[PDB]
């Protein structure tokens, strides 16, 4: 009786939300950006190839100086690279080799990683002893760690395969806030530039917008047909892009609370692993299972270019904070640095 | 740029120290053979191989056969959904699949799990070392006659023991029909697709069986040997 009535009320609320979004869908982003000129052909060359990982690379993250980057591989190795010289700054042997994510702290003093061990491990890069040591192991997730991002030297947000995201106090080792509401494995998260909000994409084909301080879900974004594997905030924080297993990338707007544009091609039938924006947000770079990275025009949904330099799955990519270069990691155990030329 | 030159030499020196360590790790990594252990709760996968270390939720077993190191990984502390974390093991030497043969109710469940692993895009080149565990209980169940396989598998009514079958001495003919029908049920899946890139190695094993480590060693040799033979157009 009560249960049957409640699930009927959910359908009424879902229709109410759908009508509200349709009411404000006066125009389409495609129609708005039809007049603007295209970006042309985007040609990027492999400036650097980072060799030394002996297994599939699963994650990478640039440091805020746009020169150092950290990559994680399932050979049990965290490597910090000097991208300008290709020198290896550090090589951190992991206690558990099944790492799935890595994060570089904005201060540059810490890196984080974690995988099937259900632990987010924090490593101190600046010690008087001259070596990298484990400073914290964040336990509490009951599933694999899929993504982690530092807010500062003391706070980090993690997404897990136990359908929850958590905000951690690194000094105390306890999760201050738990973000629940996903019905599938949360695969990725992206922080807003002001670090007051973050979006997460899960395997329930939905993206949720979370308030960091309040700790509740503000908005829910649907429209994908399969698991979301990647998510990235637009540079101004008012939008985000997702990548799913349905071979599509979608651009959602926070304030309009709905999808604005879909980035898919008929030839593309493979899943999407990673998404990122250029510094101005005009370019959306996406990694695919077919070993390639497609550069999209974010405003016009045009495939601007292709990064074809890997012999296995493109597992991750990222654009520097200054926008100078993009790094791509792959299951073929290599990282490549790309940028254009005048 | 005297100060800059000093930093470049220090960074170059630091890189060389890392590479020397990475060379040592390369020999250890390539010498070890990694295995994924899969099975339901009813199957006794934890007692298949007679060094066991619990690293977080993942249970690891390290055993050595003829100076060859095998690292078997058992994923314990995860939700029942596995389509995401199964991709972590796309490069293992083989997958150890353990099935409770006596349990007819969950037999189709194991077949469905085996089907997904065999046909997954990221596991298309991984052989499966199938262990049909608890064969002693299957013999007791068949001889008792309380439960019939035809109730769950109607094909078994018109199934006959293969000519190549090698029944154990002093084994009832009704037992070897049940043993090989279950094995053939898994072989129907493994021979449907694969294109010679991976093969399924089924074994009949009991709880008191100390030869399972050697069987994994033998099958792993066949898996890599067939990969080498196929590469040289010899297979």
């Amino acid at each position: 009786s009560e249960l049957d009535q409640l699930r009927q009320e959910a359908e009424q609320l879902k229709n109410q939300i759908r009508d509200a979004r349709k009411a404000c869908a006066d125009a389409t982003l495609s129609q708005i950006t039809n007049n603007i000129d295209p970006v042309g052909r985007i040609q990027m060359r492999t400036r650097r190839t980072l060799r030394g990982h002996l297994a599939k690379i699963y994650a990478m993250h640039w440091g805020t100086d746009s020169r150092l980057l950290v990559s994680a591989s399932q050979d049990g190795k965290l490597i910090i690279w000097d991208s300008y010289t290709t020198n290896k700054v550090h090589a951190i042997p992991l206690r558990s080799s099944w790492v799935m994510t890595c994060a570089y702290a904005p201060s540059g003093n810490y890196v984080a990683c974690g995988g099937l061990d259900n632990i987010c491990s924090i490593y101190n890069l600046k010690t008087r002893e001259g070596n990298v040591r484990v400073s914290r192991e964040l336990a509490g997730h009951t599933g694999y760690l899929s993504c982690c991002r530092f807010l500062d030297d003391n706070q980090i947000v993690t997404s897990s395969g136990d359908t929850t995201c958590a905000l951690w106090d690194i000094e105390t080792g306890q999760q201050t806030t738990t973000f629940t509401g996903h019905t599938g494995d949360v695969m990725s998260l992206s922080l807003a530039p002001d670090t007051r909000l973050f979006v997460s994409g899960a395997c329930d084909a939905s993206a949720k917008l979370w308030d960091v301080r309040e700790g509740m879900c503000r908005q829910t974004f649907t429209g994908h047909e399969s698991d979301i594997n990647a998510i990235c905030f637009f540079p101004n924080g008012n939008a985000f892009a997702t990548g799913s297993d349905d071979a599509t990338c979608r651009l959602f707007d926070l304030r309009a609370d709905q999808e604005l544009m879909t980035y898919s091609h008929d030839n593309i039938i493979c899943g999407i692993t990673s998404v990122s924006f250029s510094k101005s947000g005009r370019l959306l770079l996406a990694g695919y299972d077919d070993f390639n990275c497609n550069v999209w025009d974010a405003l016009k949904a045009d495939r601007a270019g292709v990064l074809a330099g890997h012999d296995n799955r493109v597992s991750c990519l990222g654009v520097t904070d200054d926008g100078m270069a993009v790094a791509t990691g792959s299951w073929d155990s290599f990282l490549k640095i790309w940028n254009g030329s005048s | 740029t005297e100060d800059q030159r000093n930093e470049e030499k220090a960074q170059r020196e630091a890189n060389k120290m890392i590479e020397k360590q990475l060379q040592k790790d390369k020999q250890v990594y390539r010498a070890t053979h990694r295995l994924l252990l899969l099975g339901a709760d009813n199957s006794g996968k934890s007692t298949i191989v007679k060094i066991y270390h619990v690293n977080s939720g993942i249970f690891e077993t390290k055993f050595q056969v003829d100076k060859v190191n095998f690292h078997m990984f058992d994923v314990g502390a995860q939700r029942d959904e596995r389509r995401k974390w199964i991709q972590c093991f796309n490069d293992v030497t083989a997958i150890i699949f353990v099935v409770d043969s006596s349990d007819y109710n969950r037999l189709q469940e194991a077949l469905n799990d085996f089907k997904s692993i065999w046909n997954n895009r990221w596991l298309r080149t991984i052989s499966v070392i199938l262990f049909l565990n608890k064969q002693d209980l299957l013999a007791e169940k068949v001889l008792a006659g309380k439960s019939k396989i035809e109730d769950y598998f109607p094909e078994f009514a018109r199934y006959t023991t293969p000519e190549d079958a090698t029944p154990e001495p002093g084994e009832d003919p009704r037992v070897t029909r049940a043993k090989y029908f279950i094995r053939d049920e898994f072989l129907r899946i493994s021979t449907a697709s694969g294109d010679g890139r991976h093969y399924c190695y089924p074994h009949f094993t009991c709880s008191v069986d100390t030869e399972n480590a050697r069987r994994i060693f033998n099958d792993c040799r066949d898996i890599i040997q067939r990969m080498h033979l196929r590469q040289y157009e010899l297979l």
């Epitope: 019905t183 698991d227 297993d245 | 029942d80 046909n119």
Partner: nanobody, 128 residues
Framework: QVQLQESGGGLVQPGGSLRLSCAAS????????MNWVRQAPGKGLEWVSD????????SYTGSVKGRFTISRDNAKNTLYLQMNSLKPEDTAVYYC?????????????????????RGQGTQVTVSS
């Protein structure tokens, strides 16, 4: 939003016939393999039958083989399950489960406790 609505079912005498319908929305129905999953009272979910993307490949569980027929209509975006000669052991909640990814032969987690691409289910009762 991906949503599946199971319709049909109810109280049927043993030996009767029953047809189940699954209405698909929020995804390209022709790109996914579809499954039928049931959960008997006091028991966990079990897989019943599946049908490939084009309907060429069809499978069943041995307990319902010869009595259940599964068909799909890609144009109608609908999935069907014809259940004739029913048995009291078939009393269960029937679920319409979609395989998680398109253009795949594997189908991993349809018979899982909390699966996102599985419908609310329809109740089928055979006990007299």
């Amino acid at each position: 939003q991906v949503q599946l609505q199971e319709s049909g079912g109810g109280l049927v005498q043993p030996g009767g016939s029953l047809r189940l319908s699954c209405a698909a929305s929020g995804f390209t129905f022709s790109n996914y393999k579809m499954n039928w999953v049931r959960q008997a009272p006091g028991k966990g979910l079990e897989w019943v039958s599946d049908i490939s993307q084009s309907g060429a490949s069809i499978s069943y569980t041995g307990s319902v083989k010869g009595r259940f027929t599964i068909s799909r209509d890609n144009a109608k975006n609908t999935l069907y399950l014809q259940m004739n000669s029913l048995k009291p052991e078939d009393t269960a909640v029937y679920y319409c489960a979609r395989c998680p990814a398109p253009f795949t032969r594997d189908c991993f987690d349809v018979t899982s406790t909390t699966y996102a691409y599985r419908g609310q289910g329809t109740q089928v009762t055979v006990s007299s």
